[PDB]
Amino acid sequence: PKIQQQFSDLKRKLAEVTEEEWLSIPEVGDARNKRQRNPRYEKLTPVPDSFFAKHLQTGENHTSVDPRQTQFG
Amino acid sequence: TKKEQKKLRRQTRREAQKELQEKVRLGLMPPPEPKVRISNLMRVLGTE
Amino acid sequence: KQAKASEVAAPEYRVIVDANNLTVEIENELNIIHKFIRDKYSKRFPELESLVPNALDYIRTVKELGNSLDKCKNNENLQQILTNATIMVVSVTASTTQGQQLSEEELERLEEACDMALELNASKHRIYEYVESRMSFIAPNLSIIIGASTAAKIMGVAGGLTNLSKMPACNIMLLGAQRKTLSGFSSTSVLPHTGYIYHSDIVQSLPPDLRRKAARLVAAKCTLAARVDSFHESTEGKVGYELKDEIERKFDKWQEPPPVKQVKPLPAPLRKKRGGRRYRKMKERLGLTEIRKQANRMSFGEIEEDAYQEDLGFSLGHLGKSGSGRVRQTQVNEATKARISKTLQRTLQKQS
Amino acid sequence: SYMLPHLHNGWQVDQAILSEEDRVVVIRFGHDWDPTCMKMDEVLYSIAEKVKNFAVIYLVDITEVPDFNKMYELYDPCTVMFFFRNKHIMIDLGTGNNNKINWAMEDKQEMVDIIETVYRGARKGRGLVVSPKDYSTKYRY
Amino acid sequence: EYLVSPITGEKIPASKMQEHMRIGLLDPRWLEQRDRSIREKQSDDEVYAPGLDIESSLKQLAERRTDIFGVEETAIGKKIG
Amino acid sequence: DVNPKAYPLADAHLTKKLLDLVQQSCNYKQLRKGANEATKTLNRGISEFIVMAADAEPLEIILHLPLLCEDKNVPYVFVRSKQALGRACGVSRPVIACSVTIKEGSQLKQQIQSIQQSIERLLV
Amino acid sequence: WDRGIPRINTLFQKDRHTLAYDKGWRVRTDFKQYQVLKQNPFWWTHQRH
Amino acid sequence: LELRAAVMHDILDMMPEGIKQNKARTILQHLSEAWRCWKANIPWKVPGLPTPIENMILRYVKAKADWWTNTAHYNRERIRRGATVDKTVCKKNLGRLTRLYLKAEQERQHNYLKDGPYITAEEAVAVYTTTVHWLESRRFSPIPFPPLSYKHDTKLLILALERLKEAYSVKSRLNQSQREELGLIEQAYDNPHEALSRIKRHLLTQRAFKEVGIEFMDLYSHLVPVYDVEPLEKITDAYLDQY
Amino acid sequence: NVMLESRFEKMYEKIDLTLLNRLLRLIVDHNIADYMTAKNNVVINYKDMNHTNSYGIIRGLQFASFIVQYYGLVMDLLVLGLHRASEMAGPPQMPNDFLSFQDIATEAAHPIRLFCRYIDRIHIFFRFTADEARDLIQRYLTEHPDPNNENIVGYNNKKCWPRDARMRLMKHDVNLGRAVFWDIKNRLPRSVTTV
């Protein structure tokens, strides 16, 4: 029901926490290092010219075929 | 150690170059010239 | 038996040393009887040696399997010996042994060998139990660091405190390392390079990812404590307590929660830059090459055929479309050739 | 929604707008209990540390601080307004109201983009910047 | 133990010699970097409100919303019902 | 200077010579740092000799090394401080034992032989 | 010329002698959905084969 | 956001008010850290955390997790039924379902490890003998390890390299991981025999491998796993597949 | 005639690594098989989540297609029986074609007349005589009784077709379809895979 009804018993039980117990309560620190948290940067660096060369090389097929290549070779 | 020796050399070089650049900043030593060579003859002094 | 009954000029440690030399003698007799069992059994089911490398497990398996290989199926006693994966592997292999039966007198001889091997195993258990009981007197610091069963086992496998003292830490870490054949898995068996030290409760009471880092430290400190004890110094146990305190402090340091780390704000959405050999090279790498310049273009009104099914709209420009380019084919720039990093290269070199 | 600083009267709002000469003052007019305001405030809270070099975020309750309701037409549940050097920075979000963000933003990155665009455009003395994304639709499909 | 320093040459003994080798080779730029970090990381205004305002804001949120709190199920954003 | 169980304790001049030779062996990649590496070189007989510092707080952690040198016929002494041995070994951390090892056709032959002859003459 | 289900013009392809060693290419084209984070409309075929 | 506000208000009301007021934000830090630990299927335990605060945070995490799972499934059902929905909602739901699936998969792997193989060797023996009899009936000669002077070893290597390469063919903008993968492919193509030696060494000796990455492609009806393998192991695996 | 169209429920996930290693050693050198099965047992990661794929298979591996096809060949053997598998494939000297048989008599020697397996989807075409169908239905019903004629409630037919174009669920070919599915599902151990 009222969100603040499921936590009523725990809220009541919180009263037994001593004031010194309210002061240990460690600060939360991340566990991931300098590379995970703030990575330096990712450059783009376009594709090599060999990709275009091979794409245009795919083609200019042939003028003749060895009479040995069958329906599947 | 090797690391300590390299660190000492690096600190000495950095101190020397920093003092040299402060001297250049204060006119005591005229600003350095570009290190022109035969291969550098046309990148530094092309129009000349 | 006299020592245990009287456990309420002929000292105790002479008995201890004689017993510990008897342990290695027993181990040698155990390995020769294992040799005999393996040699005389590998004509019925010869593949088992390649499936169960442990000597005692092999002996128990040949005592249990015997000449009847129907006892690999619907047999609970194997589950007391082997892992389920290796049990199913040996069942699979025993389905296709290609090995003839054993003669009856051969079975009698092999059963006698198995029984004598088990007798020697029981004797080894009893003598190691006595050594473990006498730990506190015979090696106070080494027992302080790692229990009593672990210290007893490591010096029993090493051959006494004197033999263990002349051993480096990188080998004490490996006291009890079993072959541990991998059956399909990926050397995820926790025993590729682990021994009695790694399976000691002090190392096992850590997260599974710090356990090898803990085992190395424990082995080093155990080497130190064994060297301390080999001359019977620090009888009361100060050195062992200091080493254990150091080990526990280094273990707490590893599990100490990570420090509070600040969030880096975005710098600013907004100066002169140099130029030289590095700038020229980086500009040439990122420069728009003639082949890449020519793929940028596209003829007007000259409709190209849609090559490369997998992605329509992918089109070369004036590369080969017989449009307005040049007569000869364009050449690949060497500066655009893909290369690997410096760290990646050094890892590719350490791999060799 | 409660971690961000709150402005408790119109004078504090005016001083917060005036106190910044190098960061975009981002002010959320609305009620902390409103669902739309809480949705917007989660996003503003998640980016408040990331943009502290060029933006500051304040919250304002439009009942406890009612002076700007008629002035700024603060008659929507949530409203996000950008000021740069005592000047309201209009933004052409494509929603027909170039004066405010009167809805809840679902993305952490889109508000960072909007704040950075406002900052970069307003440094050049522009009263109206153009949002990098058109919000005339929701691209649901 | 009167030793010799490969940096200065003074007679530093056995134990404090090691620390000498950590201090005599300490980079002077480290001092400038640490002072720069102190000057840059301590002149920053707090992004979030202090604890006072967090407690107050949560209190007013509880007061202005009984859909999440209270025992009487009142309206969405009205006063105390 | 304090512990008498470190019996072959060298003098100052021999300490200088020995640390210098250890530095040269580290330069020639003939040095093995640490007690565990000294033990591993003992078991293979690939060691000319062994130097060990007499200042390990537990000293008996390096007295197995003399007993193994006796079994393998390897010269051994004690030096006065661990930090000097560590620095002589190219390691900022305190090294308590190092092993100068054999290498066929090396240029450090004569110095090693002389330091050995000096070493196996002070052992009493 | 462009007829036949293996496309008789594929006999003339430049790579015709280094494709004879590519076996099981349909299965790996189908399984490519588990390696690249994109849906391939021509998962069933291969233009060079 | 209502649950977090309620839990924070409840924990901060029991705060000793006048004696301490700077630790309001660390409570939120703990409340978010516990939720992140739940989302990562990582156990959450703070040493210095008092037991009542621990229990309140655990209750918050359980309530938020129940709502999170229910919202994930409801939204997935909405996406599947062709309902009109934003792109960002689909991406957030995909990220949510990835974590739910991987929690259910860690549980499945743990169950397999605890309960061992489910294949009860008798029927495993049946399957194996069936396969053995089939292969003997076909007179199938087992595939050998690739010989040193394997004639068309380089042809298979080139096929594997081109198969790996034909994923960046249209990706006009590269990436550091993609740049490294392309560099490895080019280095193996320019220097084929050393690459083949490395592949043979990996096949003979390598049994432990670096972790792979898992992503989910959303087909709006089911999630398709996509696995990112290390570029150095991909070359060996591609060659092995071709061979 | 009866067409069963199905797929092994979760083939990829329920592949034992140890059994896969032992099955692969029948085909390839043990080094290669050990390499592949070890490569399947790696750590799987998603942004903070890390587990170890100790049970299932990894589809993203390059050779995962080969492993899946071979493992599905094993299931094809389990379904067809060695005799029918050897008759469909024919003698190794002259292997059969796509769906051809050496002789007409060999084709009609078994209920299962056509069989195909896409990566994990099986299609089996049976042709039953008037007596074999009733014997199989009788065995299925003696195994699973159905006095209320409840077998039509769960039956699936393609709703894309009109009412008279799809399958008619009379009484006999519903029990026959259930019997065929039951008989095909029994020869697959549920531990390995299930339908």
Curated annotation (Swiss-Prot), chain B:
Location(s) in or outside the cell: Nucleus; Nucleus speckle
Q: How is it modified after translation?
A: Ubiquitinated. Undergoes 'Lys-63'-linked polyubiquitination by PRPF19 and deubiquitination by USP4. 'Lys-63'-linked ubiquitination increases the affinity for PRPF8 and may regulate the assembly of the U4/U6-U5 tri-snRNP complex.
- Where is it expressed, tissue-wise? Highly expressed in retina, liver, kidney and blood. Detected at lower levels in heart and brain.
Q: How does it assemble?
A: Component of the precatalytic spliceosome (spliceosome B complex). Component of the U4/U6-U5 tri-snRNP complex, a building block of the precatalytic spliceosome (spliceosome B complex). The U4/U6-U5 tri-snRNP complex is composed of the U4, U6 and U5 snRNAs and at least PRPF3, PRPF4, PRPF6, PRPF8, PRPF31, SNRNP200, TXNL4A, SNRNP40, SNRPB, SNRPD1, SNRPD2, SNRPD3, SNRPE, SNRPF, SNRPG, DDX23, CD2BP2, PPIH, SNU13, EFTUD2, SART1 and USP39, plus LSM2, LSM3, LSM4, LSM5, LSM6, LSM7 and LSM8. Interacts directly with PRPF4.
Function summary: Plays a role in pre-mRNA splicing as component of the U4/U6-U5 tri-snRNP complex that is involved in spliceosome assembly, and as component of the precatalytic spliceosome (spliceosome B complex).
- The name of this protein is U4/U6 small nuclear ribonucleoprotein Prp3
Task: List the source organism.
Answer: Homo sapiens
State the gene name recorded for this protein: PRPF3
Q: Could you say which residues of the full protein are shown?
A: 441 to 488 of 683
Swiss-Prot record, chain D:
Phosphoserine PTM positions read S131
Q: Which residues form a coiled coil?
A: none
Q: Which residues cross the membrane?
A: none
Q: Where in the cell is it found?
A: Nucleus
Q: Which GO terms describe its cellular component?
A: cytosol; nucleoplasm; nucleus; spliceosomal complex; U2-type precatalytic spliceosome; U4/U6 x U5 tri-snRNP complex; U5 snRNP
InterPro entries attached to this UniProt entry? Dim1, Thioredoxin-like_sf
Record-linked Gene3D superfamilies? Glutaredoxin (3.40.30.10)
Q: Which keywords does this chain's UniProt record carry?
A: Cell cycle, Cell division, Deafness, Disulfide bond, Mitosis, mRNA processing, mRNA splicing, Nucleus, Phosphoprotein, Spliceosome
Query: Sorted alphabetically, which Pfam families does this protein's record hold?
Result: DIM1
Q: How is it modified after translation?
A: The disulfide bond seen in structures determined by X-ray crystallography and NMR is not essential for protein folding and function.
Q: List the disulfide bonds.
A: C37-C78
Q: Report the CDD domains cross-referenced here.
A: DIM1
Which SUPFAM superfamilies does the entry link to? Thioredoxin-like
Query: Biological process GO terms, please?
Result: cell division; mRNA splicing, via spliceosome; RNA splicing, via transesterification reactions; spliceosomal complex assembly
| Its biological purpose | Plays a role in pre-mRNA splicing as component of the U5 snRNP and U4/U6-U5 tri-snRNP complexes that are involved in spliceosome assembly, and as component of the precatalytic spliceosome (spliceosome B complex).
Q: Which family does it belong to?
A: Belongs to the DIM1 family.
Disease listed for this protein: Burn-McKeown syndrome: A disease characterized by choanal atresia, sensorineural deafness, cardiac defects, and typical craniofacial dysmorphism consisting of narrow palpebral fissures, coloboma of the lower eyelids, prominent nose with high nasal bridge, short philtrum, cleft lip and/or palate, and large and protruding ears. Intellectual development is normal.
State what protein this is by name: Thioredoxin-like protein 4A
UniProtKB/Swiss-Prot annotation, chain E:
Q: Which residues carry this modification: Phosphotyrosine?
A: Y48
Crosslinked positions (Glycyl lysine isopeptide (Lys-Gly) (interchain with G-Cter in SUMO2)): K16
Q: Any idea what job this protein has?
A: Component of the 17S U2 SnRNP complex of the spliceosome, a large ribonucleoprotein complex that removes introns from transcribed pre-mRNAs. The 17S U2 SnRNP complex (1) directly participates in early spliceosome assembly and (2) mediates recognition of the intron branch site during pre-mRNA splicing by promoting the selection of the pre-mRNA branch-site adenosine, the nucleophile for the first step of splicing.
Name of the featured protein: Splicing factor 3A subunit 1
Q: What is known of its domains?
A: SURP motif 2 mediates direct binding to SF3A3.
**Expression by tissue:** Ubiquitously expressed.
Q: Which residues of the full protein are shown?
A: 409 to 489 of 793
The gene coding this protein? SF3A1
Quaternary state and interactors: Component of the 17S U2 SnRNP complex, a ribonucleoprotein complex that contains small nuclear RNA (snRNA) U2 and a number of specific proteins. Part of the SF3A subcomplex of the 17S U2 SnRNP complex which is composed of three subunits; SF3A3/SAP61, SF3A2/SAP62 and SF3A1/SAP114. SF3A associates with the splicing factor SF3B and a 12S RNA unit to form the mature 17S U2 small nuclear ribonucleoprotein complex (17S U2 snRNP). SF3A1 functions as a scaffold that interacts directly with both SF3A2 and SF3A3. Identified in the spliceosome 'E' complex, a precursor of the spliceosome 'A' complex.
Annotated compartments: Nucleus; Nucleus speckle
Superkingdom is Eukaryota
- Positions of post-translational Phosphoserine modification: S5, S43
UniProtKB/Swiss-Prot annotation, chain F:
Q: Which residues carry this modification: Phosphoserine?
A: S118
GO terms (BP aspect) = box C/D snoRNP assembly; maturation of SSU-rRNA; mRNA splicing, via spliceosome; ribosomal small subunit biogenesis; single fertilization
Q: Name one GO molecular function term.
A: RNA binding
Q: Where is this region: Interaction with U4 snRNA and U4atac snRNA?
A: 32-44
Q: Which subcellular locations apply to this protein?
A: Nucleus; Nucleus, Nucleolus
Q: Which Pfam families match?
A: Ribosomal_L7Ae
| Organ and tissue specificity | Ubiquitous.
Q: Which domain of life is it from?
A: Eukaryota
List the GO terms this entry assigns under cellular component, sorted alphabetically.
box C/D methylation guide snoRNP complex; dense fibrillar component; nucleolus; nucleoplasm; nucleus; precatalytic spliceosome; protein-containing complex; small-subunit processome
- UniProt key word Phosphoprotein: yes
Q: Where is this region: Important for U4 snRNA-binding?
A: 92-124
Q: Which of the residues bear the PTM N6-acetyllysine?
A: K17
Q: Which UniProt keywords apply?
A: Acetylation, mRNA processing, mRNA splicing, Nucleus, Phosphoprotein, Ribonucleoprotein, RNA-binding, Spliceosome
* Reported impact of G34K: Abolishes U4 snRNA-binding
Q: Give the CDD domains listed for this entry.
A: SNU13 (cd21104)
Cysteine pairs bridged by disulfides in the record: none
- Specify whether Phosphoprotein is a keyword of the entry: yes
How would you summarize the oligomeric state and partners of this protein? Identified in the spliceosome B complex. Component of the U4/U6-U5 tri-snRNP complex composed of the U4, U6 and U5 snRNAs and at least PRPF3, PRPF4, PRPF6, PRPF8, PRPF31, SNRNP200, TXNL4A, WDR57, SNRNP40, DDX23, CD2BP2, PPIH, NHP2L1, EFTUD2, SART1 and USP39. Interacts with RAD17 and PRPF31. The complex formed by SNU13 and PRPF31 binds U4 snRNA. The complex formed by SNU13 and PRPF31 also binds U4atac snRNA, a characteristic component of specific, less abundant spliceosomal complexes.
| PANTHER family (UniProt xref) | RIBOSOMAL PROTEIN L7AE FAMILY MEMBER (PTHR23105)
From the Swiss-Prot or TrEMBL record, give the protein name: NHP2-like protein 1
Organism name: Homo sapiens
The coding gene here is SNU13
